[PDB]
């Protein structure tokens, strides 16, 4: 598939607060503009005891910086999950040290290469150079055509 995904992943570790530091999409249109249909801002990851992952985020739709709730259900491979929101159905965890940074992608199995959007999340509202280093290292192999990194000030702001 599209993954170079994480092996030996404990989902329960990723629990708590997260900030969208950086994001990137094959199709420019999806991340282009604030209102773009995959311009989502992760707030918190709440992994359920079932082994699934609930994901809390902000998306700009109509005027307000709305806040949605997506549940990524566990598949065969621990590092891949089944969502059904934002016209995506897959969530791939590429890498994470749990403590600082977490790299992941969203894509539609239907059209991966047009649907693929990948975010560098961080634990602290501070642009970590280590996180971005490993993020861009992963994105070299990917066919990304838009790339967005934010600043601590943005990361605290609402649709930051
Ligand atoms: Ca559950």
UniProtKB/Swiss-Prot annotation:
InterPro entries to which the protein is assigned, alphabetical: Blactoglobulin, Calycin, Lipocalin, Lipocalin_CS, Lipocln_cytosolic_FA-bd_dom
Species of provenance: Bos taurus (Bovine)
Quaternary structure and partners: Under physiological conditions beta-lactoglobulin exists as an equilibrium mixture of monomeric and dimeric forms. Interaction with LMBR1L which mediates the endocytosis of LGB has been observed in PubMed:17991420, but not in PubMed:23964685.
Organ and tissue specificity: Synthesized in mammary gland and secreted in milk.
Disulphide linkage map: 65-159, 105-118, 105-120
Function of the molecule: Primary component of whey, it binds retinol and is probably involved in the transport of that molecule.
Lineage of producing organism: Eukaryota, Metazoa, Chordata, Craniata, Vertebrata
Protein name: Beta-lactoglobulin
GO CC terms, sorted: extracellular region
SUPFAM superfamilies tied to this protein: Lipocalins
Pfam families in the record: Lipocalin
PTM comment, free text: Alternate disulfide bonds occur in equal amounts in all variants examined.
Protein location: Secreted
């Amino acid at each position: 598939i599209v993954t170079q995904t994480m092996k030996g992943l404990d989902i329960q570790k990723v629990a708590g607060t997260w900030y969208s530091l950086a994001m990137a999409a094959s199709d420019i249109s999806l991340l282009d503009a604030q209102s773009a249909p995959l311009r989502v801002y992760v707030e918190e990851l709440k992994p359920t005891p079932e082994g699934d992952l609930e994901i809390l985020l902000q998306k700009w739709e109509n005027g307000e910086c709305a806040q949605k709730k997506i549940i990524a259900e566990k598949t065969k491979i621990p590092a891949v999950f089944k969502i059904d929101a934002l016209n995506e159905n897959k969530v791939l965890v590429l890498d994470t040290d749990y403590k600082k940074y977490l790299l992941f992608c969203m894509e539609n199995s239907a059209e991966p290469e047009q649907s693929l959007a990948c975010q560098c999340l961080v634990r602290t509202p501070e642009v970590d150079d280590e996180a971005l280093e490993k993020f861009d290292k992963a994105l070299k192999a990917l066919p990304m055509h838009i790339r967005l990194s934010f600043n601590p000030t943005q990361l605290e702001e609402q649709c930051h």
